[PDB]
Design a protein around this ligand. Structure first.
Ligand SMILES: O=c1ccn([C@@H]2O[C@H](COP(=O)(O)OP(=O)(O)OP(=O)(O)O)[C@@H](O)[C@H]2O)c(=O)[nH]1
Ligand SMILES: Nc1nc2c(ncn2[C@H]2C[C@H](O)[C@@H](COP(=O)(O)O)O2)c(=O)[nH]1
Ligand SMILES: [Mg+2]
Ligand SMILES: [Zn+2]
Ligand SMILES: [Zn+2]
Lengths: 74, 49, 48, 1269
DNA sequence: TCAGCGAGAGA
DNA sequence: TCTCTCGCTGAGCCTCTCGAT
RNA sequence: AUCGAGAGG
């Protein structure tokens, strides 16, 4: 489903070129940082976990910015 | 092309007038070329090499 | 993927270490173009 | 760490400052030892040490000693890479002129000084440069500029160049070189060789010669040689400096060992092999491979199969890293060795690695955007890449040994970029038009329509079934045939309910195969999409409907299911081609005999002196084209209809099951031309230049050709192959010019807010609507007054995008024409806004921000030309000539209408057309315009205007071979300006019934006869001049060249009686290769060379026509605004492209047209700083005017310019793009003279320097950088 | 080689 | 003011093999 | 790395 098509993934964002959200922050902090994935992995490689997260609706630019602000304080 | 004399024409594409410009060429097996051609002014002109 | 001396090594090390992050620089072809144009006698430079 | 590129002239002090080493005296290179000789072109003190962290002298060789100079040689220790950076200089005894400034352009030195180029040329070559340097130093710029202003074209050029020097700060004396720089050593390598000798580059020997001549001048002047001899080798030094940089411009280019000209510094920049177009706009990348492609029809639409041997090499670093992670290896070398040994752990790791990384596949010619796509890879055992069958039509990829190349994305963002924008599941629709690209073809259609086609009295006909499952069971069991006509209870879902699906079940009369086919369609589509024989068009329309109604994922699933079912049932079909399948009719020889009789009569006519040669040629070619069309029709009828089967003991006819007819009717592969050449006449062949009418090839490919016919046929094959191999270059050049002219504009804003736009109206060509109004405005936002044909009531509001339902609403009320806003009439700066462009055709909704429109438009216009050029030899070289229509018959009944007509009534009373651009429009009774026709000069209309005409009636009759001249007024004819042997020729035929005068051509006319212009003037019976109704001047007709007159002087002629006939040029074989030069001329804005006269000032109205003829685009622009020229260019280009059948949307041509016109000439300066009439960029003028209006001052007034794509691309704000396009020397020297600045705004400006392009995913980064400033 | 375009020639 | 010789610019993409400098 | 000659798409 999500591995084949990302139409539902981009419907939440509304801009196809706004994949910087999916890659530059979410996938990177999963790969390098200690951040834990939200949805179950299902043995999927990263960058497909993030796309699934945006497809369901946990990850968006405002949410990631808010979380970043949360770890800004101490 | 065999050595000898050959008469050719530019088919009118040389100038915007469209007049055919006939010319002759003497091609040797060994030596220098030699051409007689016209101009839209209707004058002979010899070209060497 | 080519023409940058430091980017190739840095990205190779990053891929080996599992980090898929690149730090691009300026290609050497632009440098050689600039050097040969400067050799030709026309001053060309990068201003900041 | 930079934001701009600054280019200017180099002062001698700057060059002296560049050098790290002292001087360049000794001319030597190497070979004193293996160490390089002191002070040579490869040295140590000057250009740095040769060995890393080790000096040449050998005192110290440790990085702990880095930063110390040497003692034996004085060479500082540094990493050897610095040899790629350092420079040096040569001091010339005598100053030498730079050839770039003196030549290769309107001479800069020749415009600083008034005297022409020849004087300076003779001065430099001593037939001296010091004199030119002294003269350049002598002038003062401000005084001469003030003088030149005092006298006040050439003076404007001189003053602008002087002001360029004044502003830029480049002193003229810097033009003459005093010190010459040298390249770094590693930039011109001394490449090692297997043998003892070392290969030497061209630059080293040129530098060596220059040093030799300079050092000769150094010692000779020191010895006080006589003035006669000192001057001679100064010319040689000038020639050597000429050879070193930009060799070959002064003539007699220096040749080395062999007879090949040497390669100079300026040859490393310009040309195909220069750094711009070989190492900056295209590179050789790592992590890539190449291999042949096979079919592998077991894949899904998002998958590609690649070999294990390729993958194990492509993904080596990932394998190394994960082997280190698993703990199997402790270092890189151990994991490497494990990789060469190819153990099982390596294969398991590789299977884990390639799980979700997509890979990019591209073919060799990347004509358009779909030529590169991202696929999910699956490992296969073999050596060839497996590619999905549906994708091939996008790539233009067959399996005749064709190859492909694969790259692997490396980083995270690259993987997401490939997954979201590159993956093949996203590319469903082409960016050039709304039609989809993944269309089943060949075997898939072959199976599909065979499933859906019906037969009479099959096995199991007349049966009632529960549903599709019972149909499949009956077919697989063998109790019923696949073509049986049955009744099935089928259930269908519809989405007519608001946001919901509702079901309805009914008994429908169908066939078994259609019942099985019904089982794969997705929920929510009507049955009637599969209750018919599915050709290629039907399947494509079904896929388009599925995309429109349901979405994208159901469309992908449906495409995969369609491919699988088509393959399976095509295989089970067992359809084969046989020699008994091709059938020949019996009318063929009859119609060939009658055509032979006709052409023999034409030859007899030409034997008499009544007709000329070209007219006979045209007549014969038309006769044979008509005969070929007739034989094709008769044979296709015989193939189609002739199948008779009996039902319950009575005969009946049906559509044939013949293999060839099925193959042709399918549209899978083949056309009517191939079938007609297999079973009719092969036709008329076309030479590489034109057509040939030698003989009719009255032999099929079933019954073999003889020797003469095959020899004739070889001409078309030669023509096709030559056309392909020698017009692909022209097509590529046009595509490159379009790309380089329209590379810059991107979407930048959402809504500019303007109101105006162009008016879209339906277009028809003689009774068949090629483009209806629906697709003319499909996806374009409305501009103004789109209200329905009901007064004061609006059907649709303003500034809304037209969907499919909106278009259906327009069609239901039958709107005639609609005004829509376009790209050209946009007010945004440095780009276009989203709304004016409209819907992007690839995605299906409004265009987002940051999509590069220009590249898409250029590729869309460029692909069809080269593709159709390459596909020329498929048809076999047959002439694509359609017989010209002698008359016009209206298809449907309606009122007659004549537009822009000037006509006269002859004795017969028929309306004789006397205007060049008369048009006939067919209008129905209600008032809608139905059909449009073009009426050539001299046509006669049987029925007068204003009388209703029934269908099938004849409207006009004319001869297309000759264009007559018609008499306006009745009177006696008098010959004028006719002299035999000077302007006309007279002959009397022996016995032909006619004696005629042929007007001599202007080319053949003698010098004396040019002043006299031949003409025919009508006179009164008494000898006076005839009076035209309401005209001051009498009637006279100017007979042009190649005119024929049978009339004699003093003969009374009736009104509307032809006098002279002008035979028309043949111009046969209308083809894509025959039409592309028209497109190139249109986009280059070339002069028609016979322009039509347009009234500049109304008082006659503005834009009217005075004398008929071709209309130049410049006149149309400057008299009617940008909208009219946009309409003209778009209509002409679409007219050229429509004959071949390729579909290109208008917005791309509109984008190109807007891209051409960017410059303006200012007529009144106003309060701005621009002076008089200058060519300046339009946007800068717009901001200047807006600022002046803001500050309460007077704005400027200006007029457009129109420039060809080459000139427009060569004249832009940025100089890097212009240099990288072509004519590098001119652009580079002009930029150096003017001291220009580059802001790196476009695409190539960032691509060359290696940054994120300001489009797509780099738009956000560019916007952040801009907002920071 | 063919096909165009700009600057310089007289007429 | 203008019609003509003469010069310089350009002319599709990717890949494979051999020899000879 | 060039030049020349083939060949494939
Ligand atoms: O000079 C050429 C020749 C060929 N090609 C590329 O190869 C294709 C033509 O060569 P093909 O033989 O592969 O295509 P084809 O299907 O039309 O020929 P047949 O099988 O019917 O015999 C072209 O479409 C182009 O992609 C070029 O790009 N340039
Ligand atoms: N690649 C290559 N170039 C060579 C070889 N031998 C000489 N050359 C080059 C160096 C010079 O440019 C030129 C000298 O040729 P000469 O023998 O005519 O040819 C060789 O074996 N291989
Ligand atoms: Mg092929
Ligand atoms: Zn030392
Ligand atoms: Zn706009």
């Amino acid at each position: 489903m999500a591995r084949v098509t990302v139409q539902d993934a981009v419907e939440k964002i509304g801009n196809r070129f706004d994949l910087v959200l999916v890659a530059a922050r979410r996938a990177r902090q999963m790969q390098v940082g200690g951040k834990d994935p939200l949805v179950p992995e299902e043995n999927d490689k990263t960058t497909v976990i993030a796309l699934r997260e945006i497809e369901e609706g946990l990850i968006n630019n405002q949410i990631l910015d808010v979380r970043e602000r949360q770890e800004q304080q101490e | 092309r065999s050595p000898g004399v050959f008469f050719d024409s530019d088919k009118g594409k040389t100038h915007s007038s469209g007049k055919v410009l006939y010319n002759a060429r003497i091609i040797p097996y060994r030596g220098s070329w030699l051409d007689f051609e016209f101009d839209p002014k209707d004058n002979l002109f010899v070209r060497i090499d | 993927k080519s023409d940058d001396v430091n980017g190739r090594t840095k990205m190779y090390k990053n891929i080996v270490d599992g980090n898929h992050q690149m730090e691009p620089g300026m290609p050497e072809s632009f440098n050689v173009l600039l050097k040969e144009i400067r050799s030709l006698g026309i001053n060309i430079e990068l201003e900041d | 760490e930079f934001d701009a590129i600054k280019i200017a002239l180099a002062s001698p002090d700057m060059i002296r400052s560049w050098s790290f080493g002292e001087v360049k005296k000794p001319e030597t290179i190497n070979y004193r030892t293996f160490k390089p000789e002191r002070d040579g072109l490869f040295c140590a003190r000057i250009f740095g040490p040769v060995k890393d962290y080790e000096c040449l002298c050998g005192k110290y060789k440790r990085l702990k000693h880095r930063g110390v100079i040497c003692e034996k040689c004085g060479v500082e220790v540094t990493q050897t890479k610095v040899r790629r950076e350092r420079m040096g200089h040569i001091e010339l005894a005598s100053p030498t002129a730079h050839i770039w400034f003196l030549k290769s352009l309107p001479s800069r030195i020749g415009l600083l000084l008034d005297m022409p180029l020849r004087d300076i040329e003779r001065v430099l070559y001593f037939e001296g440069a010091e004199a030119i340097q002294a003269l350049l130093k002598s002038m003062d710029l401000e005084q001469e500029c003030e003088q030149l202003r005092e006298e006040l074209k050439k003076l404007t050029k001189r003053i602008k160049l002087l002001e360029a020097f004044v502003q830029s700060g480049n002193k003229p004396e810097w033009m003459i070189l005093t010190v010459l720089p040298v390249l770094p050593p590693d930039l011109r390598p001394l490449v090692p060789l297997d043998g003892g000798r070392f290969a030497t580059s061209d630059l080293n020997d040129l530098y060596r010669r220059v040093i030799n001549r300079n050092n000769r001048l150094k010692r000779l002047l020191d010895l006080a040689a006589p003035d006669i001899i000192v001057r001679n080798e100064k010319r040689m030094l000038q020639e050597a400096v000429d050879a070193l940089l930009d060799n070959g411009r002064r003539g007699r280019a220096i040749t080395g060992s062999n007879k090949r000209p040497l390669k100079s510094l300026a040859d490393m920049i310009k040309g195909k092999q220069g750094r711009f177009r070989q190492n900056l706009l295209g590179k050789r990348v790592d992590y890539s491979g190449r291999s042949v492609i096979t079919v592998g029809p077991y894949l899904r639409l998002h998958q590609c199969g690649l070999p294990k041997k390729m993958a194990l090499e492509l993904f080596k670093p990932f394998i190394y890293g994960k082997l280190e992670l698993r703990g199997l290896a402790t270092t890189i070398k151990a994991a490497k060795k494990m990789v060469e040994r190819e153990e099982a752990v390596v294969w398991d790791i590789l299977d884990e690695v390639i799980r979700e990384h997509p890979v990019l596949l591209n073919r060799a010619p990347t004509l358009h955007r779909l030529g590169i796509q991202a696929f999910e890879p699956v490992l296969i055992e073999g050596k060839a890449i497996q590619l999905h069958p549906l994708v091939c039509a996008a790539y233009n990829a067959d399996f005749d040994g064709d190859q492909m190349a694969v790259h692997v994305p490396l980083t995270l963002e690259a993987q997401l970029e490939a997954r979201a924008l590159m993956m093949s599941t996203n590319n469903i629709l082409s960016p050039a038009n709304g039609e989809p690209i993944i269309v089943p073809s060949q075997d898939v259609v072959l199976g599909l329509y065979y499933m859906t086609r019906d037969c009479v009295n099959a096995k199991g006909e007349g049966m009632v079934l529960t549903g599709p499952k019972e149909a499949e069971r009956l077919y697989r069991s063998g109790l019923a045939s696949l073509h049986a006509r049955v009744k099935v209870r089928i259930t269908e879902y519809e989405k007519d309910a608001n946001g919901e699906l509702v079901a309805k079940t009914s008994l429908k009369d169908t066939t078994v195969g259609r019942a099985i086919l019904w089982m794969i369609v997705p929920k929510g589509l009507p049955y009637s999409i599969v209750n018919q024989a599915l050709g290629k068009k039907a399947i494509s329309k079904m896929l388009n409907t599925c995309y429109r109604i349901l979405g994208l994922k159901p469309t992908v699933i449906f495409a995969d299911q369609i491919m699988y079912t088509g393959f399976a049932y095509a295989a089970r079909s067992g359809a084969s081609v046989g020699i008994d399948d091709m059938v020949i009719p019996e009318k063929k020889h009859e119609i060939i005999s009658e055509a032979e009789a006709e052409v023999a009569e034409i030859q007899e006519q030409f034997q008499s002196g009544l007709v000329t040669a070209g007219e006979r040629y045209n007549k014969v070619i038309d006769i044979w084209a008509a005969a070929n069309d007739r034989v094709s029709k008769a044979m296709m009828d015989n193939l189609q209809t002739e199948t008779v089967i009996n039902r319950d003991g009575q005969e009946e006819k049906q559509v044939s099951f013949n293999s060839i007819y099925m193959m042709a009717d399918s549209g899978a592969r083949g056309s009517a031309a191939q079938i007609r050449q297999l079973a009719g006449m092969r036709g008329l062949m076309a030479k590489p230049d034109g057509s040939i009418i030698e003989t009719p090839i009255t032999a099929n490919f079933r019954e073999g050709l003889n020797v003469l016919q095959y020899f004739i046929s070889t001409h078309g094959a030669r023509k096709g192959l030559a056309d392909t191999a020698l017009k692909t270059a022209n097509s590529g050049y046009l595509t490159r010019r379009l790309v380089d002219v329209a590379q810059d504009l991107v979407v930048t804003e959402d809504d500019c807010g303007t109101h105006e736009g162009i008016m879209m109206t339906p277009v028809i060509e003689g009774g068949d609507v090629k483009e209806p109004l629906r697709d003319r405005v499909l996806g374009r936002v409305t501009a103004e007054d789109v209200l329905k044909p009901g007064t004061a009531d609006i059907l649709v509001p303003r500034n809304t995008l037209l969907h499919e339902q909106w278009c259906d609403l327009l069609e239901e009320n039958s709107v005639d024409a609609v005004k829509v806003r376009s790209v050209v009439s946009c007010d945004t700066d440095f780009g276009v806004c989203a709304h004016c462009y409209g819907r992007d055709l690839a995605r299906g909704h409004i265009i987002n921000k940051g999509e590069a429109i220009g590249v898409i438009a250029a590729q869309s216009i460029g692909e069809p030309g080269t593709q159709l050029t390459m596909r020329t030899f498929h048809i076999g070289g047959a002439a694509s000539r359609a017989a010209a229509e002698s008359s016009i018959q209206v298809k449907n009944k309606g009122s007659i209408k004549l537009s822009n007509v000037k006509s006269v009534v002859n004795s017969s009373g028929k309306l004789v057309i006397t205007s060049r651009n008369t048009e006939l429009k067919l209008i129905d009774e209600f008032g809608r315009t139905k059909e449009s026709y073009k009426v050539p000069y001299g046509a006669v209309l049987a029925k007068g205007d204003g009388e209703q005409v029934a269908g099938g009636e004849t409207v006009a009759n004319w001869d297309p071979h000759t264009m007559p001249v018609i008499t306006e007024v009745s009177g006696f004819v008098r010959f004028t300006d006719m002299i035999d042997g000077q302007t006309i020729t007279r002959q009397t035929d022996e016995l032909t019934g006619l004696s005629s005068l042929v007007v001599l051509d202007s080319a053949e006319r003698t010098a004396g006869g040019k002043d006299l212009r031949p003409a025919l003037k009508i006179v009164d019976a008494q000898g006076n001049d005839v009076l035209i109704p309401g005209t001051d001047m009498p009637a006279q007709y100017f007979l042009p060249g190649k005119a024929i007159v049978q009339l004699e002087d003093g003969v009374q002629i009736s009104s509307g009686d032809t006098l002279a006939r002008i035979p028309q040029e043949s111009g046969g074989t209308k083809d894509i290769t025959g039409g592309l030069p028209r497109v190139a001329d249109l986009f280059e804005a070339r002069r028609p060379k016979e322009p039509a006269i347009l009234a500049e000032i109304s008082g006659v109205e503005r834009g009217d026509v005075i004398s008929d003829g071709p209309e130049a685009p410049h006149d149309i622009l400057r008299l009617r605004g940008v909208h009219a020229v946009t309409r003209y260019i778009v209509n002409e280009v679409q007219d050229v492209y429509r004959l071949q059948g390729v579909k290109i949307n208008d917005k791309h041509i509109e984008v190109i047209v807007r891209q051409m016109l960017r410059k303006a000439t200012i007529v009144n300066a106003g309060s701005s700083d621009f002076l008089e009439g200058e060519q300046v960029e339009y946007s800068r003028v717009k901001i200047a005017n807006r600022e002046l209006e803001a500050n309460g001052k007077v704005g400027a007034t200006y007029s457009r310019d129109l420039l060809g794509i080459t000139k427009a691309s060569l004249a832009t704000e940025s100089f890097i793009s212009a240099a990288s396009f072509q004519e590098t020397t001119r652009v580079l020297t002009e930029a150096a003279v003017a001291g220009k600045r580059d802001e790196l705004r476009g695409l190539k400006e960032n691509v060359i320097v290696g940054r994120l392009i300001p489009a797509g995913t780099g738009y956000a980064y560019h916007q952040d950088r801009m907002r920071r400033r």
